[PDB]
């Protein structure tokens, strides 16, 4: 399940001396710095070591720089040392390394690089006292900061800052990325992350059931485009969206499905707002739904169920509005719909989760954290980046949960993936509407809900990154344009 | 070349 | 407050001999010409000097070209000479420089470059007589004209032509740009402006409370795009615009807000004209406003106030029309709205300024000079480029005034900035609608009204300059497209 | 003095666990292969391991490729295993690595890369039996061969093949290059050599008193060319060379001195053969020596001693001939000459070594191995690459011995350097004549005899490598031309 | 005659306030640093000021950096201040500049650039005491050093170091280069020299009768190559050179004449050494001179005088040897020769200067300083870079003296030029032989002796600089090859 | 390089 | 970059 | 451009 367990098995069961793992970790930090800084000869290194195995790794780094760079100094901050940190402290001194135990603030102007080996993974407690003072000084120093394993002060299991943390230019971790490298604020504090192989059995590395979504994984999940194909080959999507107030949502979702290669995309949108979609993109089918007052209601249940009969996936929620008639409609519809559903935005906001448990057919929910918060009646702060909550929600409700944020969590309760593509251009209305259609699109082409969600979050974000100008000018329409280049660039 | 390091 | 005061302090208080300041000024003119013309050896220079310190600077220039270029002649036009001009006349002659006091028209075909040191800053009176005749000849001569400080005949405090003025290819001024280099017609007559450092204390240079808006200033005001952000981070804009007659205005304003990185943009537009916006840009939220006859009225006050509750900034005015019902609505709305307001176009045209004074919340008004003229019941000629009037208006009404023109004046009554980005492509309907949304956008993301106005005017104009073809073909839609490249190019 | 001693101190005195050193060695082999082969995923590796620590290193390599490449197999050839090889065998198996103990010949067509970890350093005995059979098969296999430490079968202390040895494409050794990587045949069998840092204290690495001559070392020994210099600054060389039979030798030596930056070069050559030198290169001074029969004799002793008075270094021997009169002359001359002497070719062939011991002034002898063999009355096979013999000769005779070969040995009996620049183009008459002058040149400019010899051998060879066409067309004249480019390329 | 006199006239006679000259000097230092360092914002400047006008200039520099760069500090080292240094100290402080009077050694690690305004021109006395300590520290500091006027410690009239001097990366002097920038060691300590125009009348700048030889001056002295020309147009040279011992000298001189465009070049060289020349370069005419023992003597007077009849210039001395018979010959020849003579090497060594005074025809003598020393019976240290001695020698003997060194002095006693082209490749036998022929060549084509000497020294050196590889490999033959490219590159 | 001149 | 390997 | 500075 995690890395301290993997280290332990590697030592106790496989028989790798823990000092070897530690040597490799330290060495890996040097090679990583060398590849980020170039030739390290001319640099002066201040290594800050705790008494834990993180500090021990730091002593390996320091020892390995000895004689090879302009200067090395270790400021040992701990009170006691673990056996392996003691051994490596011992070797550092044997090799003629200078250690001091007092951090004088002025010390860091005598150095170019700060190697932060103070606290490692599974630091639980809030950092106060002189440790904090030291970390704040380092962060104010403007020196190049390389963190060993995780920037000190980051909770490696959550990415949260434990009152204060080091901001690293480079972080070299071992075996796998840690949840705290991947979730914010931790992801910001990590800087450039390198994941070193320090000798764990590859089996154990793959015993891990949480993953960053990579280009290669998405390449391999992307559906086949067999030459002898027809529209039918690539699935049919229904998208139930829009209202008199939110007329543009349907267009973005629908176009999202098409840009990912779906054969046929149909919108059901209240008339005359349905016409907005085909004016922009006449490839779309935008069916007029006659409504009393501009919103879906139970009056439209039957028509939408009929439209659902001849499609593979239904996406619902973008721009529907939130009133009681929409609520009634969304829940009766989903209760009755025997098709995969991608449930977004306003459909989540009116969703009765009982309905979701009772469904035989699959679902993907794509909440941003305020939607999630209302859905589970928690605070945004409770739900934001809360991967365990999202897992348990998915497991309980037999759905795939795509909890959106700068790092997006995709989980079915068994497998949990983290998306790290994207930029702040996606922090703008319309973005989510696009993703919703992409997911439905990929489901329609035959990917499982989880697969479709993995692929979509990855591309949606990668497409935002391909925008040619400043990210903050990115809009959903331009994002749609960029989707096929993102797919090309996968391959 | 990828023996030692993986990316992000 | 200004440059003659800065010179005086630098002399009397700091103790820099006025002759040193003058030497530096003259020398700076030579180096500036050298960098515009390349090697000055092969050129023949006609220096035209008045009896003021501008003329004195000219004698420094002439003396410094002596022996170093093909020819130098000074035509001294003054009747008397200031002490420093006398000293430098004296040195020019000592160094073997030829001076004549008669301007024979034919003289200028014997020269390549005319150095205009006739009249400097704070020339108050209309130029007539032989001075005029001379300046007209120079302007008809087709020679390269370098003006010392300001082109002679330009009022350095207003940019107005005092009956006639020199048209310079290059102007070298000292310490800071002068208002007359920045405002038209002065800005046109200045040609290429170089601002020389001639030795004033940097403190005094910064004692100045009027500024040209620069790339660097805007770069530094641009809001932060923190990776761990959501739509909410980047603000919410309401835009109240449009009418049955002016259906496209809302689309441009709304899109202006989005292109500058605003998280959520909502328009309130009379139905069915609201649908025009989402057909063009479905990322927008365009709310249908039910109106009696195609225009906002008091019947819509309550709905717009409700819509205002859940946003950060309201922009109002683009395409609203000008009737009594619009007037009633705009003024009751703004009287009651406890949110920053960006007040444009037709909203300014019906604005009761009493309402503006009585508002607790901030405002930005974005008049073109005809709108300003009607707003303060003055002639366009009174208000155009009238920075003092705009300051006093802003100070009186507790607002930020963005008085649009080829040079745009942004002021809060305390700080006054001048924008010089842009081109005549912005002299076309729609342009102002874009700027209005950008401002609201930047306010929504957290910039003060003045900051948002500074940044926006700068980019709006820079974006027009990035258009790839002839400026006169620029339209607002293309301008929107260019905004994110302008922002990229800032950085 | 050597590496097994350095390992031992690093372990016993410094306290580095021998398993750590071994892990680092193995890891270093993987990274070296990765950098020579690129991504190793698609390769199949046959690792051949002995029971020694070389084999142990191989098990580290194999373990570290496990799970990461297409295939790994270890053929364990040993009968018993050292503790560290046992530990790493143990880990390899724990990690799921396949080991066999039988080498079936066909096995190597199932693999792309053979990792030779059979025998390491300090293998003393001739390889016969199945070990030989295996090594011969590997060499016939045409697979990529990477040797750990040294190609198996090479004596690491001499470079000699112990009946049979592996021919490697790449060899990764640790700490320092070994004498067997540097001397032939070992140097040929090594292929591309990488010297890995596996964690020995840098002090111990530098405890070694034998060195490969590097670009950086030569750059740093190169004399200063102070701008305010005259001919006198850069020394004066006398070269006593030539005979009626060998007229071109003097020209090459003399020109060798000049091309390395010597201020003044004078030849004493029997008339009229002296004229040959200034016809080719009129910059030279070529003094006519009147001789009875075309060769130097005691009749010329006095004249050469007089010529020696006003120079810094005398080079003698190139093209003198070998008769009794030359013998008498060379030995009386050197006995009496109180100047540094560079003794080459025929001067070595007639040299009485007693004379050499009895000299107060320094000497450099530049024998090829046949000259050395005659000089010490040994067989060429005894003397070729015999660095210990050359040391003892230098120590005994208070000289610097430059024993020429594809690897050239430069030693003063205390410090021993190995030159590895050059190519077979230097295996041609005239080459040595050039080197002789270069040495004298560098001595004249102020380098010690050893320094001058180090720098010269390096450049002489580097200059041969800069020849633009096939090396076998290289001649001494072209080599002279290339010397200044070699010196430029140093810096 | 010199710069303090020029300053004084500019002030007292022309009427330029000395403070203006000083402002310009200081400003010029800033602009020069800006052009060498780029944007100076990010730099910290330590300005070291004496109490003289050099220090005063430094205060101008410091004041002008105030507010504009990261840091400025002035360490004022003087005891008293001149009026203008007092004024500028005063202004620096008024502008908020920090001054200290104690130089603490550690101070220079807080700064990037040291501006050395301690001692200016006409420092006479040896620097000892704390001034020395300070200058030594600066030189050990490894900071960028900019010297004002001259590096402190250099005698501006001789280039000699007054016990210790600053080594500058950049030196900014005013009006003209000073003799101490041009002669070594001063020329080395100066680093990159910029000569600023600080406002002196151009007449006074040209009142100076000592000059650096520039490309433009040489371009303009180069003789005309009229299309309708014959061999005869380009002059005829006789070169009397060579001996049995020095056979290659004639070839180099002769080829030197041809490469500069001389129509006909004839050597008189003792047979058979004359044959060496046409074997190398068959374009040459090399006349056999029958001699008793390999050297010219009075037996050859008549033949050489006859050969002199049908040429324009005779060059004599290269490789003649120094015996009494050569002495007799050289002096009777020159006493009798009614043709311009270029007298080199061994001809100078046997020259009776009485003979030189008594000649109606012109002469150029080309001594290196050891030849000059013997010629005037002074020590090399007396004569080296002794431009006044060379002037007086030329004036007394009615000759042009080309006193060779890294800076070569060419003088006729009235005009004195300094050559600064070349490199240490010219510090090698043969170099001077080439120059000798070039001079004779240029005289033959019609340049005066002084003109021919100016042009030749310049090109000889420029040709050495065009060598493509390391300068120390340059030989005279290669120098000959490079002469026509040097001439091309002039134009 | 900006010591002497600023732009517009 | 030279921490791990030296050349020949 | 040569108004201010000459070379060597």
């Amino acid at each position: 399940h995690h890395m301290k367990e993997i280290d332990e098995l590697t030592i106790k069961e496989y028989g790798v001396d823990s000092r070897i793992l530690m040597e490799r970790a330290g060495i890996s930090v040097v090679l990583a710095m060398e590849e980020e800084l170039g030739n390290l000869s001319d640099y002066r290194f201040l290594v800050l070591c705790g008494g834990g195995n993180n500090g021990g790794d730091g002593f390996v780094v320091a020892r390995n720089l000895l004689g090879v760079v302009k200067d090395v100094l270790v400021v040992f901050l701990g009170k006691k040392k673990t056996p392996d940190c003691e051994y490596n402290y011992g070797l550092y001194k044997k090799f003629g390394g200078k250690v001091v135990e007092q951090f004088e603030p002025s010390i860091l102007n005598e150095f170019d690089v700060v190697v932060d080996a103070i606290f490692g993974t599974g630091l639980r407690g809030e950092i106060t006292g002189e440790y904090a003072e030291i970390i704040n000084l380092v962060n104010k120093s403007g020196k190049v900061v390389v963190s060993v394993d995780v920037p000190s002060g980051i909770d490696s299991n959550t990415g949260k800052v434990l009152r204060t943390a080091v901001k690293a230019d480079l972080t070299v971790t071992f075996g796998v990325p840690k949840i705290g490298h991947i979730l914010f604020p931790g992801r910001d504090l990590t800087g450039k992350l390198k994941v070193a192989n320090i000798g764990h059995p590859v089996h154990l590395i793959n015993s891990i059931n949480r993953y960053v979504i990579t280009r290669e994984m998405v390449r391999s999940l992307l559906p086949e485009r067999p030459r002898d194909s027809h529209k039918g080959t690539y699935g049919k999507v229904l998208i139930i969206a829009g209202s008199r107030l939110y007329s543009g949502a349907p267009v973005l979702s629908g176009m999202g499905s098409l840009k990912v290669g779906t054969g046929l995309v149909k919108l059901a949108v209240p008339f005359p707002q349905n016409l907005i979609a085909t004016s922009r993109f006449p490839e779309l089918i935008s069916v007029p739904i006659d409504t009393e007052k501009g919103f879906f209601s139970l009056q439209n249940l039957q028509e939408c169920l009929e439209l659902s009969k001849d499609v593979d996936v239904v996406a619902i929620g973008p721009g529907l509005g939130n009133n009681e008639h929409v609520r009634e409609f969304v829940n009766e519809f989903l209760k009755t719909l025997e098709k995969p559903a991608v449930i977004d935005a306003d459909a989540i906001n009116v969703l009765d989760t009982s309905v979701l448990k009772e469904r035989k057919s699959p679902a993907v929910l794509t909440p941003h954290p305020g939607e999630m918060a209302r859905l589970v009646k928690k605070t945004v702060g409770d739900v934001k980046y809360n991967y365990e909550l999202a897992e348990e929600f998915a497991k309980e409700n037999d759905c795939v949960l795509v909890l959106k944020s700068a790092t997006t969590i995709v989980t079915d309760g068994e497998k949990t993936l983290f998306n790290i593509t994207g930029n702040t251009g996606l922090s703008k209305g319309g973005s989510g509407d696009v993703l919703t259609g992409m997911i439905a699109g990929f489901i329609a082409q035959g990917l499982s809900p989880l697969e479709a969600s993995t692929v979509s979050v990855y591309l949606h974000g990668f497409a935002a990154e391909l925008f040619e100008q400043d990210e903050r000018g990115l809009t959903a329409s331009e994002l749609l344009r960029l989707i096929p280049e993102a797919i090309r660039r996968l391959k | 070349x990828x023996w030692x390091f993986h990316x992000x």
Side-chain angles (χ1 to χ4, degrees), chain A residues 28-69 71-78 81-92 95-97 99-101 103 105-109 111-123 125-132 134-139 141-156 158-159 161-178 180-191 193-206 208 210-214 217-218 220-235 237-275 277-279 281-291 294-305 307-308 311-323 325-331:
Chain A
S28 95
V29 175
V30 174
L31 291 168
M33 290 181 102
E34 180 171 61
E35 97 175 19
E36 210 67 12
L37 304 176
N39 187 287
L40 308 176
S41 272
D42 290 0
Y43 286 91
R44 299 168 303 173
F45 293 80
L46 184 66
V47 188
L48 307 174
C49 292
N53 287 338
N54 199 243
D57 298 352
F59 280 116
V60 170
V61 172
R63 194 191 74 246
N64 276 302
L65 297 167
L66 283 184
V68 158
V69 302
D71 204 19
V72 197
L73 177 61
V74 172
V75 184
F76 171 65
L77 300 173
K81 289 175 194 70
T82 61
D84 291 344
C85 171
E86 249 301 324
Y87 177 67
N88 286 102
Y89 167 64
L91 286 178
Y92 173 75
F95 276 57
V99 183
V100 301
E101 300 196 72
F103 186 93
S106 61
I107 197 51
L108 51 73
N109 291 111
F111 295 93
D112 312 299
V113 182
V114 188
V115 179
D116 153 42
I118 308 171
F119 300 128
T121 59
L123 176 75
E126 300 288 299
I127 296 170
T128 53
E130 202 198 318
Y131 275 121
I134 292 176
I135 287 174
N136 291 339
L137 292 164
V138 167
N139 289 348
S141 76
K143 300 292 156 181
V144 176
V145 178
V146 178
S147 299
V148 181
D149 220 348
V150 299
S152 301
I154 292 303
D155 189 329
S156 64
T158 65
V161 165
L162 304 164
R163 213 185 79 120
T164 185
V166 161
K167 191 173 197 302
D169 297 276
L170 171 63
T171 303
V172 186
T173 198
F174 323 109
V176 285
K178 317 281 180 290
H181 296 125
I182 293 161
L183 301 181
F184 291 88
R187 184 174 160 208
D188 186 55
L189 295 194
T190 295
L193 182 66
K194 285 166 181 159
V195 178
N197 164 33
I198 65 165
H200 305 98
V202 175
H203 182 240
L204 293 182
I205 294 297
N206 302 343
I208 305 287
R210 308 200 167 112
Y211 311 96
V212 185
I213 302 163
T214 61
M217 165 183 329
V218 176
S220 74
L221 288 172
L222 223 49
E224 288 279 16
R225 305 295 290 195
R227 303 210 262 148
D228 196 12
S229 50
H230 52 290
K231 218 186 292 127
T233 315
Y234 301 116
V237 174
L238 181 66
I239 284 162
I240 292 156
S243 67
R244 68 190 310 259
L245 296 178
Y246 313 106
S247 48
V251 186
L252 295 170
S253 296
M255 208 54 213
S257 302
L258 288 175
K259 294 304 206 163
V260 299
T262 305
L264 187 147
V265 184
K266 183 177 282 185
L267 326 168
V269 181
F271 175 80
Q273 284 78 36
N274 68 298
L275 295 178
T278 51
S279 65
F281 297 124
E283 298 89 310
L284 289 171
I285 295 166
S286 190
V287 177
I289 298 303
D290 300 308
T291 71
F295 297 92
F296 282 99
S297 71
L298 289 178
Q299 162 214 354
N300 302 126
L301 182 56
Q302 185 183 323
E303 189 174 6
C304 292
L305 284 168
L307 290 174
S308 297
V311 306
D312 299 305
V313 193
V314 178
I316 180 158
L320 288 185
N322 173 342
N323 49 74
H325 288 18
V326 175
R327 183 175 296 276
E328 290 170 357
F329 170 68
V330 165
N331 291 297

Side-chain angles (χ1 to χ4, degrees), chain A residues 221 364 400 410-412 415 417 447-455:
Chain A
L221 288 172
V364 181
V400 169
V410 181
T411 185
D412 62 354
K415 204 179 177 200
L417 310 108
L447 299 211
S448 76
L450 183 74
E451 289 167 352
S453 298
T454 302
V455 165

